[PDB]
UniProtKB/Swiss-Prot annotation, chain A:
Primary localization: nucleus
Subcellular localization: Nucleus
GO molecular function terms noted in the UniProt entry: transcription coregulator activity
Keyword set, alphabetical order: Acetylation, Activator, Nucleus, Transcription, Transcription regulation
Any one annotated GO CC term: nucleoplasm
Protein name: Mediator of RNA polymerase II transcription subunit 29
Tissue expr: Widely expressed in embryo and adult.
General function of this protein: Component of the Mediator complex, a coactivator involved in the regulated transcription of nearly all RNA polymerase II-dependent genes. Mediator functions as a bridge to convey information from gene-specific regulatory proteins to the basal RNA polymerase II transcription machinery. Mediator is recruited to promoters by direct interactions with regulatory proteins and serves as a scaffold for the assembly of a functional preinitiation complex with RNA polymerase II and the general transcription factors.
GO biological process, any: positive regulation of transcription elongation by RNA polymerase II
Species this protein is from: Homo sapiens
Residues of the full protein shown: 55 to 187 of 200
Family: Belongs to the Mediator complex subunit 29 family.
Subunit-level organization: Component of the Mediator complex, which is composed of MED1, MED4, MED6, MED7, MED8, MED9, MED10, MED11, MED12, MED13, MED13L, MED14, MED15, MED16, MED17, MED18, MED19, MED20, MED21, MED22, MED23, MED24, MED25, MED26, MED27, MED29, MED30, MED31, CCNC, CDK8 and CDC2L6/CDK11. The MED12, MED13, CCNC and CDK8 subunits form a distinct module termed the CDK8 module. Mediator containing the CDK8 module is less active than Mediator lacking this module in supporting transcriptional activation.
Curated annotation (Swiss-Prot), chain B:
GO MF term list: nuclear thyroid hormone receptor binding; nuclear vitamin D receptor binding; transcription coactivator activity
One record GO biological process: transcription by RNA polymerase II
Entry similarity comment: Belongs to the Mediator complex subunit 16 family.
Subunit-structure text: Component of the Mediator complex, which is composed of MED1, MED4, MED6, MED7, MED8, MED9, MED10, MED11, MED12, MED13, MED13L, MED14, MED15, MED16, MED17, MED18, MED19, MED20, MED21, MED22, MED23, MED24, MED25, MED26, MED27, MED29, MED30, MED31, CCNC, CDK8 and CDC2L6/CDK11. The MED12, MED13, CCNC and CDK8 subunits form a distinct module termed the CDK8 module. Mediator containing the CDK8 module is less active than Mediator lacking this module in supporting transcriptional activation.
Protein name according to UniProt: Mediator of RNA polymerase II transcription subunit 16
Curated annotation (Swiss-Prot), chain C:
Disulfide cysteine pairs (residue numbers): none
Post-translational modification: Ubiquitinated by TRIM11, leading to proteasomal degradation.
Domain of life according to the entry: Eukaryota
Factors inducing expression: By 12-O-tetradecanoylphorbol-13-acetate (TPA).
Compartment list: Cytoplasm; Nucleus
Family the UniProt entry places it in: Belongs to the Mediator complex subunit 15 family.
Protein name: Mediator of RNA polymerase II transcription subunit 15
Described function: Component of the Mediator complex, a coactivator involved in the regulated transcription of nearly all RNA polymerase II-dependent genes. Mediator functions as a bridge to convey information from gene-specific regulatory proteins to the basal RNA polymerase II transcription machinery. Mediator is recruited to promoters by direct interactions with regulatory proteins and serves as a scaffold for the assembly of a functional preinitiation complex with RNA polymerase II and the general transcription factors. Required for cholesterol-dependent gene regulation.
Tissue occurrence: Expressed in all tissues examined, including heart, brain, lung, spleen, thymus, pancreas, blood leukocyte and placenta. However, the level of expression varied, with highest expression in the placenta and peripheral blood and lowest in the pancreas and kidney.
Oligomeric and partner information: Component of the Mediator complex, which is composed of MED1, MED4, MED6, MED7, MED8, MED9, MED10, MED11, MED12, MED13, MED13L, MED14, MED15, MED16, MED17, MED18, MED19, MED20, MED21, MED22, MED23, MED24, MED25, MED26, MED27, MED29, MED30, MED31, CCNC, CDK8 and CDC2L6/CDK11. The MED12, MED13, CCNC and CDK8 subunits form a distinct module termed the CDK8 module. Mediator containing the CDK8 module is less active than Mediator lacking this module in supporting transcriptional activation.
Amino acid sequence: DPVQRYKMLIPQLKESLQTLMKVAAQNLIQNTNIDNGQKSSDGPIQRFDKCLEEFYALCDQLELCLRLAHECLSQSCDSAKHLPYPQYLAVIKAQISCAKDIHTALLDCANKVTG
Amino acid sequence: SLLRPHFLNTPDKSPGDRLTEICTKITDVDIDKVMINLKTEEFVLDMNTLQALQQLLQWVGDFVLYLLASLPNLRPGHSFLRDGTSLGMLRELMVVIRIWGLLKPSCLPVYTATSDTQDSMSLLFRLLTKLWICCRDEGPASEPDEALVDECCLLPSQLLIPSLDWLPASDGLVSRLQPKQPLRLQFGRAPPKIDHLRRLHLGACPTEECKACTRCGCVTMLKSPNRTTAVKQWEQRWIKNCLCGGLWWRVPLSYP
Amino acid sequence: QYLCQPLLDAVLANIRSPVFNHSLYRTFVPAMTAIHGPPITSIPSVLQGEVARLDPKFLVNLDPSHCSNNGTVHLICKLDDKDLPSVPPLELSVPADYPAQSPLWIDRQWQYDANPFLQSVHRCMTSRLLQLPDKHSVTALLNTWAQSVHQACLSAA
Ligand SMILES: [Zn+2]
């Protein structure tokens, strides 16, 4: 799914970039045609700001999906790094207690040096 | 001054006075009902100067919106909320802006609206009439009712209140001085950039050179940007002085 | 280029208008300020560097004579070294804009006469001067001087 969501989001991203650049050019040309002395049709000018925030929403969806997938894959890598379910819970409480022991040993003796 | 009446109907009153009479007797909250009764074939321009008036009309609309959004709160607009005459003037300018927008839609101010089925000019005119009827009373001093307060609390939701430049950027010595203490100065040492008269946004570091008024401090660019499309009725007022009265004084460019 | 061209065409079409940055402001600042929030919260020292780094053999000092505190500068050096013999003081004329050009050795042929040994010093020194690369320093001149004195000691004995 996250790879396929990423493949979904890429052409939408290119579409939003195209519309953003073209709409920026349209709005700038309209504002220069008002600012300099020029006639110009009012028309369906299609505001710029919506395109800009739409692009930002697409980038948020992309970074969300990739951060999720990266956390999941790093999670699986360290999980493989470390068959009855009570045996699982026994080694899990063993690992948690052992890491707690290392941490409190370091903290207590780094405080035992001074203060 | 710009509206030249093409024919004299109801004579002995110039169209400034006809407009002020009509806007002061018609207290309708809608802008259409005021605009109907105002002989709108008289309010015609050549659609060139009418387009070039865009920045002054932009300042009018933005100041009205800033004032009405400032109502729920001492700030840069606190005096205008209780002055009936200035609010009447703002009403009259909104009505002539509506007429000129119907003639040519490019002259109008723009509001970034957080909706697309909106008539922003009519909204601001409704709130302005409801504020002004407070103060156009005889011997009134009517504090504004809560309906106006909540409607003007809704204005940042409906439109974006932009920002405004306020003219006296104070570098005068008289505020800085004190009795019994003399300032010791060096010559040439000198102990969001707009043109305040033609409301043009200069850049961060402006490329065209400028004059500064010596009393208020307003900045204008020195030569006009478009010599063809220039509302000379507005630009030629401030050739020799500022509006406050002080002289112009050329400011040197930065070159950063 | 691709996917960005119409912006480039609009902006390159509309350069040299005095209301340009007004147009950019009006079309771009409300979107950005809505999304991104409001904006932001005597002697040239090259010669002092050379003289400060010289070997204590040389004893470089300014000439009491000659123009001072002006374009070019003038030096009278010395030589102290038990191995080397006492020799005529040597006169240097360093131009202003000293790097990117070569200083000049003020020649005094008359004091390099009246001995065979000083004649050998002078001949060998003019030889190494012709051998020098262009835009050399002062220290290149002083070191060719010391090497010339050493060769004229060895060639003599
Ligand atoms: Zn002034």
